[PDB]
Amino acid sequence: MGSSHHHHHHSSGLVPRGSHMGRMVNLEPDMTISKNEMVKLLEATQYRQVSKMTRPGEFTVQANSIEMIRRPFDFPDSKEGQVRARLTFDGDHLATIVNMENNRQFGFFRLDPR
Numbered sequence: 001m002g003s004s005h006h007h008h009h010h011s012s013g014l015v016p017r018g019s020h021m022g023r024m025v026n027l028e029p030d031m032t033i034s035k036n037e038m039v040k041l042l043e044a045t046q047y048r049q050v051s052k053m054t055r056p057g058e059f060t061v062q063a064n065s066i067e068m069i070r071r072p073f074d075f076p077d078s079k080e081g082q083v084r085a086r087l088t089f090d091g092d093h094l095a096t097i098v099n100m101e102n103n104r105q106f107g108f109f110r111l112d113p114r
Contacts, residue, residue: 008107008108013030018030018031027041027087028097029094029097029106029108032094033089033092034089034091034092034093035064035089037089038061039061041066042061045068048061054069054084055069056071056072059084064095065087065095066086067086067087068086069082069085070083070084070097083100083101084099085099085106086103088108088110088111090111095109095110
């Protein structure tokens with residue numbers, strides 16, 4: 001009984017000195033971005049608001065959160081599969097991104113409405 005204040009803890013993996021630099025890495029949170037940053041990011045990540053997000057590499061835009069399709073299983077001779085995550089923005093930083101299908105692998109806290 002005890003030592004469980006919150007099941008989801010902020011694992012500081014690439015939060016300090018993540019060093020993603022630019023768009024040479026898959027979208028994921030080591031990232032600390034803002035409401036507008038996402039707005040440039042989809043542009044910056046080659047993704048644009050969508051009716052309904054299901055494509056490899058095309059996602060849907062909302063506000064404090066975007067949705068982003070996760071890099072599928074890809075082969076050289078062959079390419080297929082798709083999975084999508086929901087990508088949230090908390091404050092001036094990226095909140096999370098969650099492969100919606102399993103919604104547990106990453107999994108972080110929701111945005112507090114203002």
